[PDB]
A paper describes a structure:
To gain insight into the role of the basic cluster in stabilizing S-coatomer interactions, we generated alanine mutants of αWD40 Arg13, Lys15, and Arg300, which are equivalent to the β‘WD40 basic cluster residues Arg15, Lys17, and Arg272, respectively. Finally, the Lys15Ala mutant did not bind to either the wild-type or clientized Thr1273Glu S heptapeptides, and a 1.6 Å resolution crystal structure revealed this was due to conformational occlusion of the αWD40 binding site by an inward rotation of nearby Arg13 and His31 side chains, rather than loss of Lys15 interactions. L Superposition of wild-type (white) and Lys15Ala mutant (yellow) crystal structures shows substantial perturbation and inward rotation of Arg13 and His31 side chains in the mutant to block the S heptapeptide binding site. We therefore generated wild-type and clientized Thr1273Glu S heptapeptides with amidation at the C-terminal main chain carboxylate, which neutralizes the main chain charge that interacts with αWD40 Lys15. This approach does not perturb the binding site architecture of αWD40, unlike mutagenesis. Loss of αWD40 binding was observed for the amidated wild-type S heptapeptide but not the amidated clientized Thr1273Glu S heptapeptide. In contrast, Arg13 and Lys15 residues in αWD40 provide the basis for basal binding to both wild-type and clientized S molecules.
This challenge to normal metabolism is overcome by the activity of the cytosolic coatomer protein I (COPI) polymer, whose repeating unit is the coatomer, a 560 kDa complex of seven distinct gene products (α-, β-, β′-, γ-, δ-, ε-, and ζ-COPI)25–31. Overall, the coatomer functions to retrieve the escaped “client” proteins, such as type I membrane proteins, from cis-Golgi back to ER by retrograde trafficking. In particular, the S protein – a type I membrane protein – is delivered to the ERGIC from both the ER (by anterograde trafficking) and the Golgi (by retrograde trafficking)3,10–12. Here we utilize recombinant SARS-CoV-2 S proteins and tail peptides, including constructs with enhanced mimicry of the coatomer binding motif (clientized S protein), to elucidate the atomic structure of the S-coatomer interface.
Author numbering: 1 to 171, 200 to 331
Write the structure that this text describes.
């Protein structure tokens, strides 16, 4: 495969990127505490947002409201209105670095996870913490809402991936369903497929693991092997039978979803990769690395 780069930002180390679902925008969150809003079709900086001290690793748009959420090493979860360009309020409660924060697609909820070993669920209408998900025994490096079921997946340096049943909160509010064992070092990332009943996880063992789930059980399908340093992030291609991963070995790797064999490696000479994301609808990807952010399309070689 070939990478067709659409946009690049040069900066100090970036930690998170988020695609706007309908505008040609990305948010980027940086190790210097600042958040950038970029139009990647024109190459223009639209705005800058300063509400944190220290790295900002969590960043996400709400799918339909004019809001975004950020999460920092200062322990804050900040909720912003990008149309009025205001910091609306801070959700306080985490006791160590915030690693990931996202919005739910239907309920008025924000998810955040932290080095304090908890996942918190917040109601952004009431501004209250509505649930604290405890049970991990080391940093919680990632968490995600399922796109169509009342489930969360989380990844921890305790070497587990947990799937949590949150149907009680929708209506005990949160109960652990699966404690997925398989990684033999800390887990840095976890992801759901948007339409198939699959989960990806990756971490310090250099492995990307693929899991399948039903309502009643889960199992490990296979492993993508090859990265030669910590894997920072992994995701499913929403529309092609492909897995993507990004690593401190300075590569983005593409793998076959059905055989887990390597398809293509993309390398940077001097930059570790920290995060990758995919647009929900478009064949558009973004990656955060030591020297900034890139937005790219993926095409078949010699197309």
């Amino acid at each position: 495969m070939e990478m067709l780069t659409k946009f690049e930002s040069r900066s100090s180390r970036a930690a998170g990127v988020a695609f706007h679902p309908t505008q040609p925008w990305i948010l980027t969150s940086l190790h210097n505490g600042r958040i950038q809003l970029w139009d990647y079709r024109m190459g223009t900086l639209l705005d800058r947002f300063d509400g944190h001290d220290g790295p900002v690793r969590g960043i996400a748009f709400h799918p339909t409201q004019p809001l975004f959420v950020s999460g920092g090493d200062d322990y804050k979860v900040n909720v912003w209105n990008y149309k009025s360009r205001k910091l609306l309020f801070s959700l306080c409660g985490h006791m160590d670095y915030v690693r990931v924060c996202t919005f739910h697609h239907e309920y008025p909820w924000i998810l955040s996870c932290s080095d304090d070993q908890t996942i918190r669920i917040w109601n952004w209408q009431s501004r209250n913490c509505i649930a604290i998900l405890t049970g991990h025994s080391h940093y919680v490096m990632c968490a995600a809402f399922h796109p169509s079921e009342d489930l969360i997946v989380s990844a921890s340096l305790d070497q587990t991936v947990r799937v949590w049943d949150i149907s009680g909160l929708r209506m005990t509010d949160a109960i652990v369903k699966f404690v997925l064992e398989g990684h033999d070092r800390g887990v840095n990332w976890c992801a759901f497929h948007p339409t198939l009943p699959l989960i990806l996880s990756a971490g310090d063992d250099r492995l990307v693991k693929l899991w399948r789930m039903t309502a009643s059980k889960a199992w490990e399908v296979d492993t993508c092997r090859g990265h030669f340093n910590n894997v920072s992030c992994c995701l499913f291609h929403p529309h092609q039978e492909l897995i993507l991963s990004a690593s401190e070995d300075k590569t983005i790797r593409v793998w076959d979803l059905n055989r887990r064999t390597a398809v293509q490696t993309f390398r940077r000479d001097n930059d570790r990769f920290w995060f990758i994301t995919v647009h929900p609808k478009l064949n558009l990807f973004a990656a955060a690395h030591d020297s900034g952010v890139m937005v790219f399309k993926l095409e078949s070689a010699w197309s």
